[PDB]
């Protein structure tokens, strides 16, 4: 069956993408501190292939870490739109998830998923660096289940 061969090309491209995730240098609030601690020696995200890059065009994942305000909302969407596809978004913490401690404020977007599509939600205020690393390792499992080439074949 020819469907087998594409099912083995999907594994290759899926492996290359989850093995080489490149987050954008994008933090907003206290949660971004715990994102530094995931780069610190104890957890060393770089040993999973995760490498921060400043340029949006050289990034694969946006990690929304902190509160999103109405003044900052247009800026977040722009840098997301400037990420080449395939692109993924991780929502870290409670401010980025559903407004957190400031849900009822006037200058805060209630949830970063109103502005961008989100893949993984990481709960906590802040989520421990180990909790975030669980989120990233869960995002890799979601990329390992993609069947782009097995869906194109059956079209």
């Amino acid at each position: 069956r020819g469907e087998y061969v594409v099912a083995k090309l999907d594994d290759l491209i899926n492996w290359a993408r989850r093995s080489s995730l490149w987050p954008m240098t994008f933090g907003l609030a206290c949660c971004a501190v715990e994102m530094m601690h995931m780069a610190a020696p104890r957890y060393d995200m770089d040993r999973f292939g995760v490498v921060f890059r400043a340029s949006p065009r050289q990034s694969d994942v946006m990690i929304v870490a902190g509160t999103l305000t109405n003044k900052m909302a247009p800026a977040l969407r722009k840098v997301y739109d400037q990420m080449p596809e395939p692109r993924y978004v991780v929502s870290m913490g409670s401010c980025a998830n559903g407004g957190g401690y400031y849900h009822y404020s006037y200058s805060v977007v209630r949830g970063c998923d109103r502005i961008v599509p989100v893949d993984i939600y990481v709960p906590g205020c802040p989520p421990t660096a180990e909790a975030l690393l669980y989120g990233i390792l869960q995002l890799q499992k979601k990329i390992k289940r993609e069947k782009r080439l097995r869906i194109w074949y059956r079209r």
Partner: protein, 176 residues
């Protein structure tokens, strides 16, 4: 008291002058920096082997919420609404009515885990040790709707983590 940090005058004798000149020309002070990094190359890193190795925690950790039961199996929560009245983020929603046997119990008990600030006040305000924060910190979801916990989800957590919640409360209740 106080102390000056950058108030010095170099010695101008010839030997001290030549030491500074030799340092400038031969980059001696730039090579101590290379020594410091070289020592770290031959040290052992502080990295752990996640997820096969976990970072240490303590009995006081504040992770995922749960609702507990008595050893009989009756629910601890008696719908007093103190956890709701103290939640800084207004993340808890509660309704109650007299049960079939006339017990003060809840019909609704929701926690919005995307509004919670994981502050622990709810378990401080509970007079019967019903609402606690388990030690679980690995419950990342894939949809925003999965983080809105209802009484069924929270009661399930208690029955899932009870073996460990009781051990942590036993090892910590004397400080509370």
């Amino acid at each position: 008291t106080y102390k000056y940090v950058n108030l010095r005058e170099p010695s101008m004798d010839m030997k001290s002058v030549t030491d500074r000149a030799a340092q400038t020309l031969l980059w001696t002070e730039l090579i101590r920096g290379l020594g410091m990094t070289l020592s770290y190359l031959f040290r052992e890193p502080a990295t752990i082997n996640y997820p096969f190795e976990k970072g240490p925690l303590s009995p006081r950790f504040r992770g995922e919420h749960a609702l507990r039961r008595y050893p009989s199996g009756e629910e601890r929560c008696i719908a007093c609404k103190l956890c709701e009245a103290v939640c800084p983020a207004q993340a808890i929603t509660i309704e109650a009515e007299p049960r079939a046997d006339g017990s003060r119990r809840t019909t609704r008990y929701d926690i919005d885990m995307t509004k919670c600030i994981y502050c622990g006040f709810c378990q401080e305000a509970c007079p019967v040790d019903a609402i606690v924060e388990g030690p679980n910190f690995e419950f990342s979801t894939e949809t925003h709707e999965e983080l809105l916990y209802n009484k069924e989800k929270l009661l399930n957590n208690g029955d899932k983590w009870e073996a460990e919640i009781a051990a942590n409360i036993q090892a910590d209740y004397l400080y509370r």
